[PDB]
Amino acid sequence: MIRLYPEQLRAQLNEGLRAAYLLLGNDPLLLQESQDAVRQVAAAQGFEEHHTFSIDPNTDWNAIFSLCQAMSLFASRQTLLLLLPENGPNAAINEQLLTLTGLLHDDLLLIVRGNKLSKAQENAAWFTALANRSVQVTCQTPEQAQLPRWVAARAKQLNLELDDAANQVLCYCYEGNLLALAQALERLSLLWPDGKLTLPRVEQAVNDAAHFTPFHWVDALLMGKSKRALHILQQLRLEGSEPVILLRTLQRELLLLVNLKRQSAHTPLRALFDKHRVWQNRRGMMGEALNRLSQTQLRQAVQLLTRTELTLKQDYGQSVWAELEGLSLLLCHKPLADVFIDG
Amino acid sequence: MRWYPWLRPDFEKLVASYQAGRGHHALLIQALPGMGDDALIYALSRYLLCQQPQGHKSCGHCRGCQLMQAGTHPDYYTLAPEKGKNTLGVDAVREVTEKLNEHARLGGAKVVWVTDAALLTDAAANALLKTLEEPPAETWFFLATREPERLLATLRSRCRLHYLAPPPEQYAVTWLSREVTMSQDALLAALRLSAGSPGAALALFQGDNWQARETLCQALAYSVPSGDWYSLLAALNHEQAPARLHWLATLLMDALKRHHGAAQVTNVDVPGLVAELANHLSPSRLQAILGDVCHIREQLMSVTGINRELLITDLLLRIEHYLQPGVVLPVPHL
Amino acid sequence: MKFTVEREHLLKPLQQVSGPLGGRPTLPILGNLLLQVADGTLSLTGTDLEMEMVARVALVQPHEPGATTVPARKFFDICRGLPEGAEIAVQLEGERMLVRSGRSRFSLSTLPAADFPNLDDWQSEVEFTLPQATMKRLIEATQFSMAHQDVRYYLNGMLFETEGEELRTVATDGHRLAVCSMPIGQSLPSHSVIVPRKGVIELMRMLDGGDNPLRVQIGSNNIRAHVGDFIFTSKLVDGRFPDYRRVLPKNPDKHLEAGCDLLKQAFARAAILSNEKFRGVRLYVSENQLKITANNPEQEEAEEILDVTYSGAEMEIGFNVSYVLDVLNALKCENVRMMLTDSVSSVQIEDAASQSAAYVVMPMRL
Amino acid sequence: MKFTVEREHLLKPLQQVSGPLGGRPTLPILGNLLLQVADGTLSLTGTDLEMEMVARVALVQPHEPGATTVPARKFFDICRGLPEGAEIAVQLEGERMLVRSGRSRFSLSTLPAADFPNLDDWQSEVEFTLPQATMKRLIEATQFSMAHQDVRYYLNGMLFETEGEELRTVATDGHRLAVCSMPIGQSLPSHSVIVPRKGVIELMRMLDGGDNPLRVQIGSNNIRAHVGDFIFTSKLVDGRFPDYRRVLPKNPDKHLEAGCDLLKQAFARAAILSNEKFRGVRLYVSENQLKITANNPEQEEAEEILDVTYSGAEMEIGFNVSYVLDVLNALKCENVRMMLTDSVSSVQIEDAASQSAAYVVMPMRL
Amino acid sequence: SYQVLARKWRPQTFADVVGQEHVLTALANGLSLGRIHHAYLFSGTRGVGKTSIARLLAKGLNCETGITATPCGVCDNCREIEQGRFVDLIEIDAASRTKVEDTRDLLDNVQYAPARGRFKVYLIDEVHMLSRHSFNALLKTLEEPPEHVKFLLATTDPQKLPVTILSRCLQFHLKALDVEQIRHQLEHILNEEHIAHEPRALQLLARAAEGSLRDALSLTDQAIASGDGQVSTQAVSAMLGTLDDDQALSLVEAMVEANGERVMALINEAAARGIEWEALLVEMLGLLHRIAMVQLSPAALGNDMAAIELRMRELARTIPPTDIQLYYQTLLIGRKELPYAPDRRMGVEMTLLRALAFHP
Amino acid sequence: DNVQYAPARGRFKVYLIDEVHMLSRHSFNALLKTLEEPPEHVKFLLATTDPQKLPVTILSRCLQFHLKALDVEQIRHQLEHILNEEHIAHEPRALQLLARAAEGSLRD
Ligand SMILES: Nc1ncnc2c1ncn2[C@@H]1O[C@H](COP(=O)(O)OP(=O)(O)OP(O)(O)=S)[C@@H](O)[C@H]1O
Ligand SMILES: [Mg+2]
Ligand SMILES: [Zn+2]
Ligand SMILES: [Zn+2]
């Protein structure tokens, strides 16, 4: 029942392997390296079989049952990996997992990879049964604040030397794409064996390959950093993400902000936050957004959003991204006369 | 569907044409909601499909009448949108036209009923144009629409237009009073609100729409003095948003007419709210707000899948902006 | 009122009526089967709003007149569940029919028979009788030229034309015409009607080429045919089928005779290298010579030469090889006569042995 | 280039070469067969890159040497569509091929033979003749155990190892290994190569129980088989087949000899009475007793008792019914001997009379 | 069998068609000279003779007596075309045949020679409904078709078609029929139908036709059905909801003189009498235009309004031209938005109140 | 698939694709490989009214030639020449009106 992290998982494996393993999170590089380390430790221990299966209703289970109830002809103590679906286990998958836990054997080394389960999905019969001998490695992608420390530690483990400028450049270029960040670190190490990576060194051999989500864009707009908002909008545009989801995500927070600002005239903020049941970590962010802009704003923003939606699903043009970045700049502490944007 | 008394004359007229064999193949009924145009179309189809009609009414016992009662007549190919949708596709028109393309099984006449030509798709209407121009022998069409202007020019040209005018105001008032036990003022307000078309007012009374209107009126009464129009969203955000916008538009129009001087108002049931709204707002502000409300209602009705709450709150914010002194008020212009 | 039925005799009419019926009739009662009893016979009827198929079978046990409706799916399931060769007992008791399967009793929903879309009275305009062989031959000769889906609604069926002692079937799709006429032995009024695709297909799949003649009666709007114990009625279209005399070539001067087997083999061999989509071929006809040529978009040339009898000049005619092959397959004779005027005119195909049938093919213009 | 043949002689080899070649080709020329006439022989290769089927036919007419590639499908259609017994004369004019048959002519587009994927001049590492019977026996003995679909690509096929005057085939799918050896009679260098599933399937398809000595040539990455005047070349699947020597138990002291037919019928009865999937059957063997029970915790235990000739220690093993049934089917005889060491070991099955073929399976842990 | 006037009186010769002299002359001259194109696109408003002219051209091309400017209408092919039976005249609906297979078979069967006639006419209706891929595929056929097929294209609005289609087609702009032409055609039809008619009724029906003759015939049939088989002025006025009285002028005077109570009372009583609101707006627009005209030139006023002359003249002396233009603009704005208003009464009241807001 | 085969009689197997911009993105990508390295006896002649829809790769793989709308004077001169060749009476004002009506498309 031990919750651990991939950074310190090597020591946990070295002190002794565990019957059950499961990697939960969203970071691809951390999950991949944890899986590789576990598999290598198992192989050193003497496990030669590395069976992998993907959980899906279309996929069968007779082969899985036969392999879990049977050894290997020219090996022993197999290892089985299960790739959970992105949405998460359903009732049938829950039945399958508890069945697997029922006949689980010590010689089999269980590994599970997939998106981190939710609170409702956290509790389950198979999960409780495995809790007696379950070590779960959290594999979430570090936040922007946690990114510089993570990349600095990664570089130090690689015997490289990074300054503040190089760390900032790497964070900017590979925000949320830590796999590409590590690949870039390896490439830079190969290019310059000396190990000293100054700002020209990193900047001349890097590319903008960051990946984001619309929630990150809304957070950037709330903070008010124009450069980050424009960068994330560019990344989402290049990724091909449709603007409808961005518009909806922006609209939700815009309506929340408008309601809070209008009803905060004679009502304490704490009572409103408690009633709305918003995230505790977002209380200060919402306060900063509210006090950063007055009622003069949050009015042309809504009209601009409505105009954007109309021009999107009525004219069916391609200038939606221009309107989105205009609204992004508007939400920041900018003049934005709105004559250009037709707010 | 129900057969309202005021359908007696018009029906008796239309059937007379079919009594002489000179009836128009394509008939377009211009009737407001609640006027029972569906009942009129059903009665006309029953008369047409009756094997041995007597006078105007059908016999009620011939094979055609029995099939109509059972609702399985091989003829009488009706067109209507899918229950889970709100528009009629071209495929339905295609298959109905193909079925009409051959002789009637009973050897009598074939009837086609389009429940609402307004919901008909442009492609569907254009496909229907050919069969409507030169229908096969003994083929009759019965279209229906609230606003024939919304239909295509060609389709309106093909059809013979019959306008089902509503009854006299007093007749509708007394009919509703006999039907629903409520104050005559509320009945008159509903009738004027429903464009003086009984049945639609009756439908409004039957549902919870009356309580919604009362809540909206109370919210507007609270908002007008304080100026906090945003709270109105609470009483406006609903699946029936266009109806609530129409109610608000009628209230604003009544206030404006009271300002200009008038003896009758649509919202007679709330003199106090109309008086307060007229007193607390200038005629230019009332006109601007009414135009904005009507435009947003039209956008909500015409546009499909538009974010309702977003448009409503944008309208509320713009209305609040207009009330601020020194702000230029937009004026309608084609 | 007791209904005693034998499973072995019950099987056949039920399958025939359930054939056209689908999984979702789209109406609550359309898929239901109307069972009626009159005098000493019972009729099982099924309709799909555009056809009515009724099987009439006699009985020996006493009964009383009546009519009722039974769901097709539940009835078929009950029949399947019962052991083969057993007896079926059905009783009309109240609003729900009662079926006795051995010691078990089951209740089945019933619906009024007055709601079934079936004709109560029938009027016939022209009626006659013919052996099934005549109709089978006529349809086999004419149907393959029937159009499947064309904007010209009148061209997607078969024209039945009864003139005096002669009965004729005509079909076309704008590119090929097939006509088959022959005497029937009795005089009839000059009447022409059009039977749609579904009617002809159902008639063919229902016809068995038996020795018992069938009676056909055509009314103002519908056509009904009774063969043995089955009666199928469909509704016509009356799209004013084009006159077939005009489409035929007017005095085709150039006549050439050929062997049906040789010609069909040559066309089949040419078709392999012809355009798989356009399927066009060229025929250079000269004195006792027929050169068939075919090309492909890849420029694959296929040429062959056939010896025939022909006294005309030299000409080049384009054709659709598929239509010619279909005509030859539907011909089934030892000799084939082709009549034509010029390269830009329709070409007629007949048999020297008997002219009871003829075909016309529209050439290719590039 | 020019030659003349009869469609009777070409119908079979064209079908053979064009059989495996199906679907769209990876390269356009791979969709075309390469035919070459030289020294009185016409060889047609239906290359599939991975596999090459070559059919050779004899030429007696005054041909002319030459090679060219032509699409297989249309050429085969042309050859098949001609009249039976007709002779086909093929010539090359320009970049096209002309086909003449009596009064019929065809033209086909031909790609240059240079662009055809050339069969490299790799010299066979081990070439040797062999009768068909031994090869067929080896394939039958070592084809039921190879994995049909496994992540380990090298286990999809089976491994042929030639050592001295001996050829051995080993197949496995992760649980059982079947190994069959046959003395070739001629000393050869040691060499191991994995043949893929499709290659062996095509090879066994080629086998027809003839008297032609089947010549096998094992190369660095290609295996070729000559049967009479037909050649089948396949690309050996890479990887490294696990050594079978370690898999074979050293001293399986415990022995069990029993009638093969008795075990076959017992397993068939268990399978038919235990059609439910999963839940491998558990067999308890004791002195003159064998009780097979269904592991199904829900389905009733269809226990079956047989009187085997075993008189050793008693134990219960949870085997898979399908696995043992297939293994016993592969060994079709009257008696069978199974040797095991303990509860956890690989039981080796063999014929009580012959021991050339071994069937080392392992129990399914319970 | 009884047929409506639109079907009964469909032109059967180039002389029976009313108006559109230029296109008819061009078609006749082309047929006479033998200079015939392979693509005739007809553009114009509804009810102007698209299908009629297309069918007449098809008859002229397919007549058995050679290519004739005026088809006889009695041949086998001529009669079949008149009855919609001619196989070589394929009438295609663009909206229905939008799928890929439809156009693919449309351009695949062109090679086949005509079954009966000398030209395989393709009459495609409302061509603007075809998909872009359909136009792209049909460009080749529309450019260099075989010399046995003619494409006849009909569309309400030609601009929506791809520019290439317009380039490859001869465009004939069917002018909207004027009031005089519609009145003359209706008079001729009623005289030939042995139906009595009044000049006022014919004028009103022609005015309400809005330039389309099919709409005029439909209105005439509606009046016949309602008018007990008599085209009477009173019956047509009741059917069409035409004021033809001083109510419109009184309401305009009230609107100009503010006095909202009078305007509201007038609208209330008009609604009680059940009139057509679009007719009321049109009448107001006509009155305002007449007031402007008399302000510019007093001689431009007729005698029909003599009973209301002086009062009307008073407006011409009292209202400055700019205010007249403002009122006309407001009335036109109301006209545009009347269909889209929640109710016709609400739209009219909003328009009149907006006009009332304006004042010197 | 049939591009590799040699031309029937012509020295090149010229391809002329009309309105190439209508091809799907996948079709363009599949065509890229043959466009870069076509057989020596194969020539591609793409054509489209809207060149901005084409992928940048397609544009870079081929020589572009953007035909310009013909001048009004050029259209008038061409009309005069063809009418003179056909022996048809014409007036300068009529030719000017026709040239004005035809914006830049000589076909119009
Ligand atoms: N120019 C015209 N001359 C004579 N009759 C006409 C004319 N235009 C319309 N009509 C009459 O109106 C009927 C139908 O109108 P059409 O001739 O189809 O005009 P249309 O433009 O084709 O209508 P659309 O565009 O399909 S709605 C005809 O049968 C005539 O009776
Ligand atoms: Mg028309
Ligand atoms: Zn009746
Ligand atoms: Zn004629």
From Swiss-Prot, chain B:
Its EC number is 2.7.7.7. It is an enzyme of class 2 (transferase). GO terms for molecular function: 3'-5' exonuclease activity; DNA binding; DNA clamp loader activity; DNA-directed DNA polymerase activity. The keyword Cytoplasm does not apply. Pfam families: DNA_pol3_delta2 (PF13177), DNApol3-delta_C (PF09115), HolB_lid (PF21500). One of its GO terms (cellular component) is DNA polymerase III, clamp loader complex. The keyword Nuclease does not apply. It catalyses: DNA(n) + a 2'-deoxyribonucleoside 5'-triphosphate = DNA(n+1) + diphosphate. Keywords: DNA replication, DNA-directed DNA polymerase, Nucleotidyltransferase, Transferase. One of its GO terms (biological process) is DNA-templated DNA replication. Part of the beta sliding clamp loading complex, which hydrolyzes ATP to load the beta clamp onto primed DNA to form the DNA replication pre-initiation complex. DNA polymerase III is a complex, multichain enzyme responsible for most of the replicative synthesis in bacteria. This DNA polymerase also exhibits 3' to 5' exonuclease activity. The gamma complex (gamma(3),delta,delta') is thought to load beta dimers onto DNA by binding ATP which alters the complex's conformation so it can bind beta sliding clamp dimers and open them at one interface. This is DNA polymerase III subunit delta'.
Swiss-Prot record, chains C, D:
Small molecules can bind to the hydrophobic cleft and inhibit binding of various protein factors, suggesting this may make and attractive antibiotic target. Confers DNA tethering and processivity to DNA polymerases and other proteins. Acts as a clamp, forming a ring around DNA (a reaction catalyzed by the clamp-loading complex) which diffuses in an ATP-independent manner freely and bidirectionally along dsDNA. DNA bound in the ring is bent 22 degrees, in solution primed DNA is bound more tightly than dsDNA, suggesting the clamp binds both ss- and dsDNA. In a complex of DNA with this protein, alpha, epsilon and tau subunits however the DNA is only slightly bent. Required for DnaA inactivation. The RIDA complex (regulatory inactivation of DnaA), composed of ATP-DnaA, Hda and the DNA-loaded beta sliding clamp (this protein) rapidly hydrolyzes ATP-DnaA to ADP-DnaA in a DNA-dependent fashion, preventing reinitiation of DNA replication. DnaA inactivation is stimulated by DNA synthesis. Keywords: Cytoplasm, DNA replication, DNA-binding, DNA-directed DNA polymerase, Nucleotidyltransferase, Transferase. The gene is dnaN. Its main location: cytoplasm. It is found in: Cytoplasm. This is Beta sliding clamp. Residues 245-365 are annotated as: 3. DNA binds at R24, R73, Q149, Y153, Y154. Residues 129-243 are annotated as: 2. The keyword Ribonucleoprotein does not apply. Pfam families: DNA_pol3_beta, DNA_pol3_beta_2, DNA_pol3_beta_3. It comes from the Bacteria. CDD domains: beta_clamp. Residues 1-120 are annotated as: 1.
Swiss-Prot record, chain E:
One of its GO terms (cellular component) is DNA polymerase III, clamp loader complex. It comes from the Bacteria. It catalyses: DNA(n) + a 2'-deoxyribonucleoside 5'-triphosphate = DNA(n+1) + diphosphate. Its EC number is 2.7.7.7. Keywords: ATP-binding, DNA replication, DNA-directed DNA polymerase, Metal-binding, Nucleotide-binding, Nucleotidyltransferase, Transferase, Zinc. The keyword Metal-binding applies. It is an enzyme of class 2 (transferase). GO terms for molecular function: ATP binding; ATP hydrolysis activity; DNA binding; DNA clamp loader activity; DNA polymerase processivity factor activity; DNA-directed DNA polymerase activity; identical protein binding; metal ion binding. One of its GO terms (biological process) is DNA replication. Zn(2+) binds at C63, C72, C75, C78. Changing G117D: In dnaX2016(Ts); present in both isoforms, unable to grow at 42 degrees Celsius. ATP binds at G44, T45, R46, G47, V48, G49, K50, T51. The keyword tRNA processing does not apply. Belongs to the DnaX/STICHEL family. Part of the beta sliding clamp loading complex, which hydrolyzes ATP to load the beta clamp onto primed DNA to form the DNA replication pre-initiation complex. DNA polymerase III is a complex, multichain enzyme responsible for most of the replicative synthesis in bacteria. This DNA polymerase also exhibits 3'-5' exonuclease activity. The gamma complex (gamma(3),delta,delta') is thought to load beta dimers onto DNA by binding ATP which alters the complex's conformation so it can bind beta sliding clamp dimers and open them at one interface. This is DNA polymerase III subunit tau.
From Swiss-Prot, chain F:
The chain holds residues 109 to 216 of 643 of the full protein. The gene is dnaX. The DNA polymerase III holoenzyme complex contains at least 10 different subunits organized into 3 functionally essential subassemblies: the Pol III core, the beta sliding clamp processivity factor and the clamp-loading complex. The Pol III core (subunits alpha, epsilon and theta) contains the polymerase and the 3'-5' exonuclease proofreading activities. The polymerase is tethered to the template via the dimeric beta sliding clamp processivity factor. The lineage of its organism: Bacteria, Pseudomonadati, Pseudomonadota, Gammaproteobacteria, Enterobacterales. This is DNA polymerase III subunit tau. Belongs to the DnaX/STICHEL family. Part of the beta sliding clamp loading complex, which hydrolyzes ATP to load the beta clamp onto primed DNA to form the DNA replication pre-initiation complex. DNA polymerase III is a complex, multichain enzyme responsible for most of the replicative synthesis in bacteria. This DNA polymerase also exhibits 3'-5' exonuclease activity. The gamma complex (gamma(3),delta,delta') is thought to load beta dimers onto DNA by binding ATP which alters the complex's conformation so it can bind beta sliding clamp dimers and open them at one interface.
